[model samples]
Target: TIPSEIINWTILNEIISMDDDDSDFSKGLIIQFIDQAQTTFAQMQRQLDGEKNLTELDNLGHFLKGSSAALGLQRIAWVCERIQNLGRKMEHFFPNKTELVNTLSDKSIINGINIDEDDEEIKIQVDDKDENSIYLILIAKALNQSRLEFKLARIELSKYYNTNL
Candidate 1:
C-alpha cells in the first residue's frame, strides 16, 4: 500500500486535474513504476557493496524520476531525485520502505498491488487502519487502473544524462 502523506491520490489527481479514478495517461504507469521500482531495488541490491554501481543506480534514479513526476508519484519521484544526488556523490540513501508494512494488519493492497513478496521493501503488517493504510488503499486503487496507450515516441532513454535533465 502507499503512503498518502508521501504521495496522495487526491493531490495526484489535483496535479493532473483529473478524476481520482481517471486513468487517461497514468493508469497502469503507476503499477509499472512500482514494478520497475521493484526491479530497480533488486538491481540496486546487486549494485550495492559495489562502488561503480553507484553510477548505474544514479542512472536508474534519473530514469525513474521523469516518469514518477510525470505521473504525480511525488514521493517516488523525490526518492529518485535523492538517488541521483546521493549517487552523484556516490552516497547511499533512500530505500526506506513504508514502516506500516511491519505494524498493521489486513496487509493487502485493496487496490490490487502486491509487490514481490521477497521485496522486503514492500513488507506488509497485519492489522489496524491508519492514514498510511488509507494511503496504501488509494495507491492500490490507482495502481489497479492498468496501463495506458503508448505512441511510437522514443526519446533517448539513458540513465541520468546530466545532474539536471
Candidate 2:
C-alpha cells in the first residue's frame, strides 16, 4: 500500500464537496479523468508490452506518477515510482531489463487499474471482466473507503466551522 501522506486531504475535500452538493457535475469531472487515465494506461501498457523498451516504460511511468498524484492516489503513485526506478535501472542493463520491467509492470497494472462503479460506463466494462473480478473487488473496496472518508471529513469540517462561527 502507498503511504497515506501522499494524499493531499485538503484538495480531496474540496473536490469531494464540489461533487457532494450536486454530485452530477463532480461525478462528470471525475469520470472524465478516469476515462482519460484508463485510456492512457492502456496505451502505455500496450506500448510497453510490445517494445519492452526502458525509455518507453520510463515515459509511461512519469505520466502515471503525475496523474496519480493529482488524484491523491498514493498507492498508484507508489506503483509509478517503482516503475520509474526500474525503468531507469533497465537503461543501464539493456536487454536484461525484461525480468525487472515485466514483473513490475504486471504487478503495477494489477494494483493501479481501478474501475469506478459510480460511472455507468466503467461499471459495464468491469462487469464483463470475469477473470478480473477479484481485482475489481479491490477497486470497489477502495472506492467505498474513499467515499466514507469524504462523508466523515465533511461532517467534521462542518462541525468545526460551525463551532468557530
Candidate 3:
C-alpha cells in the first residue's frame, strides 16, 4: 500500500531549522509552495482539457515533484511521480524509496523522460491504441489525487505555522 502520510515532518523540520527561530523563512517557503501549487494545478487542468500534450504534462509533473519532495509533501510528491510516469509510459507506482532510487540512473527509465537541462525535442512513439489512450485517464486521476493531497498539506502546514509563530 502507498504511504498514508501527507507530510514528512523530519524533512519539514529540517527546513525550518535552516533559518533563525525569530524569522518567518519556513512560513514564507510554505506560502511560496502554496502559490506554486495553485499555478501548476491550473496549468495541468488546462493541458488536460486541451491537447493532452504529454511532453508538457511530464514537465509539469517533474516541476512540482521537485518542490513537493523537497518541502516534505510526500504524498503529493508521490502523486506527481505517478503523473510523470504515466506521461512517459513507465511504472506509475513504486513499492519503496529504494526501488525508486535504484532506477534513478537506469538508462531505460531516464532516456526519454529526462526533464533536466536536455531541451531537445523528444520523439515519443505514441500509438493511438487502447494502451496509449489509457495514459490520459491515468494522468487525470493522478492530477486529481495530487490536488487533494496538496490541499491537505497546505492546511496542515498552515496549522503548524499558526501554532509555532
Candidate 4:
C-alpha cells in the first residue's frame, strides 16, 4: 500500500507542515503542476469510466508518468509505469494468450476497483494481476485529494488578502 503520505509526497512538500515556499519567485509556475496534474487525472477518469480503452488510457498514464518523474515523485511515477505496462500488454495481447483478462471473479467485486474478499476493509496485493487497476485507481484518488487541497489552499490565500480595500 502506498500510504497517503507517499502518494501525496511531491517536490513541494505535501506531507510537511505549513512552511511556505520562499525559494520560488514565480507564483504562476509554482502552482502550475497542480493544474497539469488535475487535468491529467480528469482525463484519465473520463477514459477509464467512458471508453475502457486501455491503449489510450495507457498513453495518458504515460504522460502522467513523465510528469510525475520530472516533478520528482518516483512512487507516483512507479505506479504510472505499471498502468502503462498493463495498457501495453492489452495492446499486444501477449499476456500469456489471455485476450481480456477477466479479473472479475465470484470471490471479488469491481465497481471501480476489485476487492478480493467481502471483508470490511479491502486488501491490496501489489504483486497480483489486479495491481494494474488498483495502482492506477490509487493514483487517481490521490490526485483528487491533492486537487481539493489545492483549491482550499487558494481560498485560504484569498482570505488573507485585503479584499475589502
Candidate 5:
C-alpha cells in the first residue's frame, strides 16, 4: 500500500493552502485526478498487451512516472522506471520463439474446450495457471497494485481533509 504520509506532510499542507481556501476542496480535486490517473493506467496496459511496442510502453511509463511523483507515489514511480528499462531491453533479452510459445501455452487455464469443475478444483486449476504465468504476470500485477494503492491514497486524503461528504 502507498503511504498517506508521502502526500500528507507539512509541505503538502502549504501547497494545499496555496491552492484552495478549503483544504477539503483541494483534497477532493486530488481524488478526482487520481481516478482519472487510474483510467490512464488501464489504457496503457491494454496498449502494452496489444502493441508490444517498447516505445509506446516507455512513453506510457514516462507519463505515469511524472503523475505518480506529483501524487507522491514514489515507490510506484520507481517501479515504472524499472519497467521502462525492461521494455527497452525486451527485444534484445526476450527468450526465443519456441521457449516463449511454450511458456505462453503453459500459462493457459483452459484449452479452448469446455470443462467443468467444482469450486476447489477451479481454484486449483487457476492456481496452476498462475504459477506458470508468474514471470510475465508480475508486470500486470504490479501495475494493478500501483493503481489500487493510488486510489486508496486518494481516499485517505479525502478522509484526512474531512471531505467524506
Candidate 6:
C-alpha cells in the first residue's frame, strides 16, 4: 500500500470525473504532465549534481512543485518545497524530517552581513565552509527523495491509466 503523500488519487479522480466516454481529457492532461515532469526531473539531476547551482535548483523545485501540487503528488511537492526554501536559506518544516529541517534552518551559520557603509573598513571571517558543506549534503538528500517520490508517483498514476503510457 502506498501513502497518500505519494499519490492522492482523489485529485486525479476529480479530473477523471470530468471525462466522457468519447474523450480522454484527463488522460491527455496526465500524459502531458508525464512528458514535462520527465524532462524537468532530468534537468533537476543535472543542476544538483553537475552544475551545483542552488538558484537553479530552487527554480526547478518551484517549477515542479506547482505542477505536482496541482496533481496531488504530496510527497514530491513537499520535498520540492524544502529544496526551494533551503536554497533561499529559509525554512519549511516537516515533522518526519525535523532533524534535516533544524540543521538547514540554523541561522547562526549564515547571518545577514549587510556592510553597506561608504567609508568603513569591513572585516569578516570565512568561517562557514564546513557549515556550507553540510548543507549541500542535506540538500542532496532532499533532492534524491523528491526524485524517488516522482518515480513512485509515476508508476501509480500509470497504473490508474491501465497502460504504461
Give lDDT per model, in order. Answer: 0.42, 0.45, 0.69, 0.45, 0.49, 0.62
Q: What value of lDDT does candidate 3 attain over all alpha carbons?
A: 0.69
Q: Residue-wise lDDT of candidate 2 within 1-165, one digit each (tens)?
A: 335342356655676687656755534554554565566555544543344455665676678677666656554565565556555663221122223223332243324323232222123134454543333333323223332223222333335334311
Q: Report the number of the highest-TM-score candidate.
A: 3
Model 6 regions lying over 4 Å from their true place = 1-3, 92-131
Candidate 3: tens digits of C-alpha lDDT, residues 16-104:
88777648787788888888988998898777777778889899999999999998988788878888888888854334333432433
Backbone clashes in model 4, listed as residue pairs: none
RMSD of each: 14.6, 13.7, 11.8, 12.8, 12.8, 13.9
**Model 4: per-residue Cα lDDT over 10-66, one tens digit each:** 553442223355434323333565567678766866765555466776787788778
Task: Identify the runs in model 3 with alpha carbons over 4 angstroms from their true place.
Answer: 92-131, 163-165
Write one digit per residue (lDDT tens) for candidate 1, span 72-144: 5554565566656665764333332344234223443222444332332223242375423322322222221
Q: Which ten residues in a row have the lowest lDDT in candidate 1?
A: 147-156
TM-score between candidate 2 and the true structure: 0.45
Candidate 1 Cα lDDT to native: 0.42
The TM-score values for the models, in the order shown, are: 0.44, 0.45, 0.72, 0.43, 0.55, 0.68
Q: The CA-based lDDT of model 2 is what? A: 0.45
For this target, which candidate reaches the highest lDDT against the unseen true structure? 3
Cα misplacement distance, residue 98 of candidate 2 (Å): 22
Error of 6 at 52 (Å): 2.0
Question: lDDT score, residue 16, model 3?
Answer: 88
